[PDB]
Structure 1
Amino acid sequence: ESADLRALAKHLYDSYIKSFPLTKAKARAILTGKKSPFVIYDMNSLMMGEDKIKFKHKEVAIRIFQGCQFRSVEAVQEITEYAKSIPGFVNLDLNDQVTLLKYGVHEIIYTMLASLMNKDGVLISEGQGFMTREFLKSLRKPFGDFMEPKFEFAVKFNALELDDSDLAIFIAVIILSGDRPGLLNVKPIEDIQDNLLQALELQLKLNHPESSQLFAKLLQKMTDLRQIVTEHVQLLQVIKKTETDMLHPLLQEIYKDL
């Protein structure tokens, strides 16, 4: 049903624009130099970055990694608003909505982080800043190897040259996964995903006509994505049992993990 697959795509894109203040288009305009980000390439610029840039968020490697978590928690609420705009989502059993978000959000976080990344570093504070990949590697060794696999993933993901229109449908596909553990009613979830997959496939065909098997290549990117998430959780589980620099009891409660 081609025309309402197109309407679904347009609806998702419009909701994506509504929910996500920094889009890939804007992020790319900055990364390609096509305003300008304050650059964090060393400890000096880091310290100067912290004073100039708001950082609405107590020693460097920790300051950075905690800041990342604070920002991810913010992203969870953006992803949640977006999910609720996916037709059918808010009428799912509430338990199932929670389950799909519980497992979906991490995956979406790394997908959207790729939009902010290139081989040389990552956009931070809504494109107001740019932290270099070298500066991150230079860090403190449980922390120098924490973003590296994300840069690896991002470089291969970004080679697909997806745009916001593509990503809006791909993110929806991720959320409506009938394979999440503990789901009560898989039927409407798979029904919704079926239509999203059809919309994604058409979108990719129209948006990237010269791009053979792009649908398949993208779906298989989900394998590396889940691996990133899995290995990131066990890095958090290592970081916790070992890191003393992680009210604050009230803060801990908000940012514990999402």
Structure 2
Amino acid sequence: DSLRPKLSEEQQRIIAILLDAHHKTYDPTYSDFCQFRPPVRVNDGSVTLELSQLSMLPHLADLVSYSIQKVIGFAKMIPGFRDLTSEDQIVLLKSSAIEVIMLRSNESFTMDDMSWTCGNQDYKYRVSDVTKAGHSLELIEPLIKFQVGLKKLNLHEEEHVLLMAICIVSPDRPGVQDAALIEAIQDRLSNTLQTYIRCRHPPPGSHLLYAKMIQKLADLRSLNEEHSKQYRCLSFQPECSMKLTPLVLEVFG
């Protein structure tokens, strides 16, 4: 029964633009990482120790800072986003940043050993690394679950970049002024996504893929609340700010 409308010339364009935006902002070789402050892995096999040292924090904060800059760059090329006021652009970037970083990080995530593999052993990040950056299992374990859940959807790159764009252009972020315009931009991206799935995604029995992706968006909101709680406590550690970057302080402060 269900109709399979073809992608319009405009939806084809939107997909091309977003894939292009991603390829410009996402280096799949991680060749910039040698520019971050080095990773340090003390032995913890302890919350006290990990707060006293924060030995992976300078490195992972440089990584997340770098990632925020790429997301700002990616967001600028989303069809519609530049029609928003600069103020709503900033609201959306700030509230979705850690969610988009979690999403985009799925490209370096691997179920080989459940790590984000960006190298070159030094640039392989495991649960134990995230705890050495002062985060707790209440964030890390659901984060790894989300990464696996996401991997197992086997998204086309078209799906992956549309899902990042939809995450960023969310009319329900606290503090937006033009909700209708944002919802209008998002609706254009969601319709492209829905159409894509039904045309392009084999069998296609899993048009059902759309609801699952939407559910990931909801998972991302809970991860975002938890990160915020833990970043707050991490920020209580004396001289923590030296281990972050101005951009990370602004975005999460």
Q: What residue number does 2:212 align with?
A: 217
Deviation string, structure 1 residues 195-228 (Cα, Å, up to 9, x no partner): 1001111222234222421011101111111111
Q: CA deviation at 1:169?
A: 0.8
Match of 2:34 among 24, 34, 54: 54
CA distance in 1, matches of 2:58, 2:163: 28
CA distance in 1, matches of 2:185, 2:12: 15
Q: CA deviation at 1:116?
A: 1.7
CA distance in 2, matches of 1:162, 1:8: 17
Deviation string, structure 1 residues 46-83 (Cα, Å, up to 9, x no partner): xxxxxxx8352187441213321221111111111111
CA contact (8 A) 1:118 1:151 kept: no
Q: CA deviation at 1:127?
A: 3.6
Match of 2:140 among 143, 147, 159: 147
CA distance in 2, matches of 1:134, 1:20: 23
Aligned residues: 227
Q: What residue number does 2:46 align with?
A: none
C-alpha distance 251-182 of structure 1, shift in aligned 2 (>3 A): closer
Match of 2:81 among 80, 85, 89: 89
CA distance in 2, matches of 1:3, 1:83: 22
CA distance in 1, matches of 2:103, 2:238: 30
CA distance in 2, matches of 1:200, 1:127: 32
CA contact (8 A) 2:36 2:62 kept: no
CA contact (8 A) 1:6 1:203 kept: no
Q: What residue number does 1:30 align with?
A: none
Identity %: 25
Q: What residue number does 1:112 align with?
A: 104
What 5-or-longer segments of structure 2 have no aligned partner? 1-6, 43-49
- 1:72-87 alignment to 2 at 5 Å? 72-87=64-79
Aligned-partner SS, 1:80: helix
Q: What residue number does 2:13 align with?
A: 7
Aligned-partner SS, 2:124: strand
Q: What residue number does 2:47 align with?
A: none
Q: What residue number does 1:20 align with?
A: 26
CA distance in 2, matches of 1:96, 1:183: 6
**Which amino acid in the other structure matches residue 173 of structure 1?**
I
CA contact (8 A) 1:136 1:144 kept: no
- 1:98-247 alignment to 2 at 5 Å? 98-119=90-111, 120-124=113-117, 126-129=118-121, 130-131=123-124, 133=126, 135-136=128-129, 143=135, 145=137, 146-210=139-203, 211-212=205-206, 213-241=208-236, 243-244=237-238, 246=240
**Which amino acid in the other structure matches residue 54 of structure 1?**
C
For the aligned residues, what is the CA RMSD?
2.9
C-alpha distance 141-186 of structure 1, shift in aligned 2 (>3 A): closer
**Which amino acid in the other structure matches residue 36 of structure 2?**
K
| TM-score normalised over the length of structure 2 | 0.78
Q: CA deviation at 1:88?
A: 1.8
C-alpha distance 128-207 of structure 1, shift in aligned 2 (>3 A): farther
Aligned-partner SS, 1:147: helix
Q: CA deviation at 1:144?
A: 5.8
CA distance in 2, matches of 1:97, 1:218: 23
C-alpha distance 144-249 of structure 1, shift in aligned 2 (>3 A): closer
Aligned-partner SS, 1:63: coil
**Which amino acid in the other structure matches residue 94 of structure 2?**
K
CA contact (8 A) 2:162 2:189 kept: yes
Q: CA deviation at 1:142?
A: 5.7
C-alpha distance 132-194 of structure 1, shift in aligned 2 (>3 A): closer
CA distance in 1, matches of 2:129, 2:73: 31
What 5-or-longer segments of structure 1 have no aligned partner? 28-52
CA distance in 1, matches of 2:57, 2:107: 19
CA distance in 2, matches of 1:141, 1:75: 17
